Amino acid sequence: DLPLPPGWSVDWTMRGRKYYIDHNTNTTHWSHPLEREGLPPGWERVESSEFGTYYVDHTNKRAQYRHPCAPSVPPPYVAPPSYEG
Amino acid sequence: DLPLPPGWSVDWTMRGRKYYIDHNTNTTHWSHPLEREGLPPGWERVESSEFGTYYVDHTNKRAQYRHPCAPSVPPPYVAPPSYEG
Ligand SMILES: [K+]
Ligand SMILES: [K+]
Ligand SMILES: [K+]
Ligand SMILES: [K+]
Ligand SMILES: [K+]
């Protein structure tokens, strides 16, 4: 949907997974560069049918469920307003 | 974007957070009912600018970073194909 910034292109893995090619920096990425609000450089949010939504750190070649910048404690439960309706 | 199933409506919290009202079951929800693929009943995926993406269990009033169905081990690191470009 969102336009690629100048200097990018897209391709596909042998499993059908889209990736983004940055010809400005000669690097490749799982996510659109305009869809990384709140993420530090080197980190991406990824979606998995087996593991759900998690985060990868390309600079350390590791992954974790928690956003890199989230408090290192479990996140807060909040319910929507009760049915009124 | 996606049409609401029959019997639903939408409203807004005093913080500007959208929620979904199910008049079929007299319940309320943070997420669109057609956007919960892979989630068990009672669980939702939520987005937070402070905590990132996590999951809430309305039946236990708790939250966790890991998808309820994800393996209880850290998720796998996978890099996109190296720049060719
Ligand atoms: K450029
Ligand atoms: K281009
Ligand atoms: K997560
Ligand atoms: K109905
Ligand atoms: K309606």
From Swiss-Prot, chains A, B:
List where in the cell it is found. Answer: Nucleus; Cytoplasm
- Cite the WW domain residue spans from the record: 2-35, 37-70
Consequence of gene loss (knockout): Mice show progressive hepatomegaly with a 2-fold increase in liver mass relative to total body mass at 1 month of age and a 3-fold increase by 3 months of age. Embryos display unchecked proliferation and defects in terminal differentiation of epithelial cells.
List every position bearing Phosphothreonine: 13
After translation, the protein is modified as follows: Phosphorylated by STK3/MST2 and STK4/MST1. Phosphorylation is not required for SAV1 stability and may increase the number of protein binding sites on the scaffold molecule.
Expression sites by tissue: Ubiquitously expressed in adult tissues with the highest level found in testis.
Q: Which domain of life is it from?
A: Eukaryota
Subunit structure, interactors included: Homodimer. Stabilized through interaction with STK3/MST2 or STK4/MST1. Interacts (via SARAH domain) with isoform 1 of NEK2. Interacts with ESR1 only in the presence of STK3/MST2. Interacts with WTIP and AJUBA.
> Its biological function?
Regulator of STK3/MST2 and STK4/MST1 in the Hippo signaling pathway which plays a pivotal role in organ size control and tumor suppression by restricting proliferation and promoting apoptosis. The core of this pathway is composed of a kinase cascade wherein STK3/MST2 and STK4/MST1, in complex with its regulatory protein SAV1, phosphorylates and activates LATS1/2 in complex with its regulatory protein MOB1, which in turn phosphorylates and inactivates YAP1 oncoprotein and WWTR1/TAZ.
Q: Which named protein is this?
A: Protein salvador homolog 1
* Organism lineage string: Eukaryota, Metazoa, Chordata, Craniata, Vertebrata
GN (gene name): Sav1
